[PDB]
């Protein structure tokens, strides 16, 4: 109906509507936020030892803290 | 090719501002403002200097004096030096060299300030690990935290569009 008169307008509105709506439905924006968060620009500053913390491991080989393992599995 | 090069570019900057504050023909004024903006770009790139002077170079020296010369072309003609313009240029150069001499061979010349007279390598960082050329991530933060600011900025520019078409005979 309008596809014959101004076709570049209709194509622009279609791709604009998907560029607005399409970021809602996603299994990937959570991955976007995780990858964008997990990049250390600054130095990871240590902390004073004992406020009686049964967490936060001392050797960086110890997997007690939250590591990243979804990276190497894409 | 020496240490006081930001100072020298500041002096050529004041030279340009005097050179079109002498009120020439407006195409000579636009030429002088392009020269002044180029050396101001040189100054701000010499203070390091990543993005902002290359940003003003597109806007004023990329899309504002173009429109000024465009409007000088369409509106005025200036169809064919004078003692007034040349006298103001000589008095401006006199003020320039007077301030430069009385600062360089002294401590300070003050309007109301305390200007320590030496080269401006001071002050600067002591070679710290900046790693992102601070202004870059600064203006990168203009979108995350800048909620209200870009909203009122875009709304002001949209209203500027409707203002220009109405004044230039809306619709």
């Amino acid at each position: 109906n309008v596809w014959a008169k101004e076709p570049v307008l209709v194509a622009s509105f279609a791709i604009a509507g998907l560029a607005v709506i399409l970021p809602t439905l996603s299994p990937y924006t959570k991955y976007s936020l995780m990858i964008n968060r997990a990049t250390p620009y600054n130095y990871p500053v240590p902390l004073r030892d004992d406020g009686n913390m049964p967490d936060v491991p001392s050797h960086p080989q110890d997997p007690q803290g939250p590591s990243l393992e979804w990276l190497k599995r894409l | 090719m020496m240490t006081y090069i930001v100072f020298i570019l500041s002096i050529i900057f004041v030279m340009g501002f005097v050179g079109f504050s002498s009120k020439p023909s407006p195409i000579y004024g636009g030429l002088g403002l392009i020269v002044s903006g180029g050396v101001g770009c040189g100054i701000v790139l010499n203070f390091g200097g990543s993005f902002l002077g290359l940003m003003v170079f597109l806007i004023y020296l990329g899309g504002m004096m173009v429109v000024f010369g465009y409007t000088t072309a369409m509106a005025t003609e200036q169809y064919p030096s004078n003692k007034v313009v040349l006298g103001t240029f000589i008095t401006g150069l006199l003020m320039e060299f007077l301030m430069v001499y009385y600062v360089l061979k002294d401590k300070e010349v003050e309007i109301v300030f305390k200007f320590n007279g030496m080269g401006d390598w001071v002050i600067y960082d002591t070679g710290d690990s900046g790693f992102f050329s601070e202004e870059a991530m600064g203006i990168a933060a203009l979108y995350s935290y800048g909620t209200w600011l870009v909203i009122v900025t875009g709304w002001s520019l949209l209203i500027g569009v409707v203002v220009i078409m109405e004044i230039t005979r809306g619709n």
Binding site: V45, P46, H59 | -
Partner: protein, 114 residues
């Protein structure tokens, strides 16, 4: 107002680890793994008390840990570490994906012998 209290040159003379910087980058991961354990004490000293001229003794201690680490990596395997850092060296800014197979060779060396 008041005078500054700056320390002496005889305390401010420790031999640096005068390696170049590209090899220092090329050996950085195992420098952070085995050593750099007592320098988080140094860095916590620095961030709590923001006074260099107060936490410099731990600077001496990280200097000697780095020097001992470089002694240990020099006298044992690898000599292919030399080929590895000159492989990572001249490739502009250092991407680790530039020289990967000799990184694997040096890793197999240090894994097997040490």
């Amino acid at each position: 107002p008041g005078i500054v209290e700056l320390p002496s040159l005889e305390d401010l003379k420790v031999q640096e680890v005068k390696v170049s910087s590209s090899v220092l980058k090329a050996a950085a991961h195992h420098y952070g793994a085995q050593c750099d354990k007592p320098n988080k004490e140094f860095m916590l000293c620095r961030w709590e008390e923001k006074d260099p001229r107060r936490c410099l003794e731990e600077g001496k201690l990280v200097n000697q840990c780095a020097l001992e680490f470089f002694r240990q990596i020099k006298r044992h395997c690898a000599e292919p570490f030399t080929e590895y850092w000159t492989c990572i060296d001249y490739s502009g800014l250092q991407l680790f994906r530039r020289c990967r197979k000799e990184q694997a060779q040096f890793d197999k060396c240090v894994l097997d012998k040490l």
